[PDB]
């Protein structure tokens, strides 16, 4: 094994790398998302920024267990980055929808990973979890969550009037 | 079609779909690159800097063929993003002779496109691949064949210290 | 002809003459839906405000063609420029649908222009229509795209509230 | 007991007292390394002030201890520092070879008195494990492993020209 590696099981080690790609899975995702509001029959470019930006902190996520991975002596073994479930994302509420359900995914993965790096005695991995990952990631979900209601309270989907108040609003001006 | 779009032949729009998967495959085998001198076993920090500035570098060639896309009025079709052909890159004369294959690759790519678009008559198409793609790509194959030089030079890759050198004085100190 | 002449096919030179007079045509048109939105009982200012840039714009891409002209010794020889084809504009979305017609318009006399410049051997013409108009003109037409969209998802032609808000938050603050 | 102390176990205290032991133990180790690569016939200055700086960080560690033990209520009982177990250090690779060892046996301390809080139900001290010295650890551990693979890559012990360019390039200039 690594010189430096101690107190790093096997099962950790392999589930660090599912979880890099989950992340990888996960900013790709995001990224399908910014460039369908980006289409000329879409246009909501502060929507499209949005989804970006979180395409970009998934990627950062992702490569934070990169080196993760290479402090504790474990192997970094990629794989396929499948690519997302939808070509189309319908409007603002469905993505949304769509992004809670993939940042609640995350979050279970997180989780688990949790419950493992407990199980093997593992309190490295559990604070890097906790203090690195955890907060981050109910975070977004809040976020999400509140402007689904907001989307909601909006009249989406049919209400486009809404849906472009939502772009102007709720969402940082690009 | 799009109310955008003019100009703009299916074949071209396919292909240009397939160099976003393209730019993205070369950003993710950038990444292993990476990755893998960032090992405790490997350890040449400026050139895991390298790969890492060139994954971020290709990400973003990937983006603007996104953006291209849609201004367009092309839609934008995701596929897998295969993971890279190595799980360990050797040493460093090996990834750069490696990269330089790659760099290669995407350059043909970026040729046979500009051959398809001028084939279909697309002046806006050629003049992107050409302003926006083919000097950088030029540049960054010179760039990497004067290194596999001074790798070789250097008595890569059984010469240790001259594999140390490089690391020190060829790549950015990061 | 011209000293300076070297090159410079008359029929390139006859059409770089109409490509001035279109330009100035569709500066012409733009100044026309700038007054109709500036009418007190239209009174969209920051809409009225887009097209008088818009009109500008065109201006200055009239000057340009007048300056490539005697640059390689062709002579300018200017027309009529002929009224708009409408003397009122209808509201937002009818001269939104106007003015991506004439981007369109504009951009097919651009591409005949650079399909003749090619059969003529002209690389100087084809680089400067690539690299100072096929991109901008591009880019114009997918903005304008998305206002469109925008302002069928905001209810135009009958939602008086959604044209107001898009003169508000789609448009530059005048 | 102490008026402050509450849901500290005695076996908690006694082992936050062994901590603090370990680490003076650690500092005089490193200190010992510093002093030797100060030697006239050895004479690596900037391999001796790194080690000069490890004996200031475990110093610092060592009364950080001191002060938890205080803020809990339990009492700073303190023993002999030991001599390090060598008096002359052979070289950059057997010093860092050293190092390695002792960081790993530290951590391994570090990681037991965790397994204790949590036997003792005390989530302070595991918090204060977890956030202030389990990262510092495996990041100091990552460091010492990555020098070793350069210094046997620049052929150590036998190559005195890699030793030389080991303590210009590897370490901070001091
Ligand atoms: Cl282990
Ligand atoms: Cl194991
Ligand atoms: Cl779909
Ligand atoms: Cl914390
Ligand atoms: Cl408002
Ligand atoms: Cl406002
Ligand atoms: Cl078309
Ligand atoms: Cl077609
Ligand atoms: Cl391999
Ligand atoms: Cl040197
Ligand atoms: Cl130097
Ligand atoms: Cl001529
Ligand atoms: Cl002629
Ligand atoms: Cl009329
Ligand atoms: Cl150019
Ligand atoms: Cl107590
Ligand atoms: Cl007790
Ligand atoms: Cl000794
Ligand atoms: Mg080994
Ligand atoms: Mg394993
Ligand atoms: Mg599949
Ligand atoms: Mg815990
Ligand atoms: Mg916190
Ligand atoms: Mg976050
Ligand atoms: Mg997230
Ligand atoms: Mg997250
Ligand atoms: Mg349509
Ligand atoms: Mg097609
Ligand atoms: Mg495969
Ligand atoms: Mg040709
Ligand atoms: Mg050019
Ligand atoms: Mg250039
Ligand atoms: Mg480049
Ligand atoms: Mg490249
Ligand atoms: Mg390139
Ligand atoms: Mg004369
Ligand atoms: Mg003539
Ligand atoms: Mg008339
Ligand atoms: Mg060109
Ligand atoms: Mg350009
Ligand atoms: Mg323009
Ligand atoms: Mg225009
Ligand atoms: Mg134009
Ligand atoms: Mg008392
Ligand atoms: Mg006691
Ligand atoms: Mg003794
Ligand atoms: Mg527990
Ligand atoms: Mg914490
Ligand atoms: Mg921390
Ligand atoms: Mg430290
Ligand atoms: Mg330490
Ligand atoms: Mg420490």
């Known amino acids: 094994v690594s010189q430096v590696r101690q107190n790093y099981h096997s099962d950790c080690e392999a589930a660090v790398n599912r979880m890099l790609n989950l992340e990888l899975y996960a900013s790709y995702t995001y990224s399908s998302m910014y460039a369908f509001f980006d289409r000329d029959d879409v246009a909501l470019h502060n929507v499209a920024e949005f989804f970006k930006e979180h395409s970009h902190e998934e990627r950062e996520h992702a490569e934070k267990f990169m080196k993760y991975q290479n402090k504790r002596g474990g192997r970094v073994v990629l794989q396929d980055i499948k690519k997302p479930e939808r070509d189309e994302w319908g409007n603002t509420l469905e993505a ?78 690009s």
């Open 96 to 173: 949304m929808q769509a992004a809670l359900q993939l940042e609640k995914t995350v979050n279970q993965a997180l989780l688990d990973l949790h419950k493992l790096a407990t199980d093997k005695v593992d309190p490295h991995l559990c604070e890097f979890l906790e203090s690195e990952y955890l907060e981050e990631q109910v975070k977004d979900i809040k976020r999400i969550g509140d402007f689904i209601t907001n989307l909601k309270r909006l009249g989406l989907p049919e209400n486009g009037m809404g849906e472009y108040l939502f772009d102007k609003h709720s969402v940082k001006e």
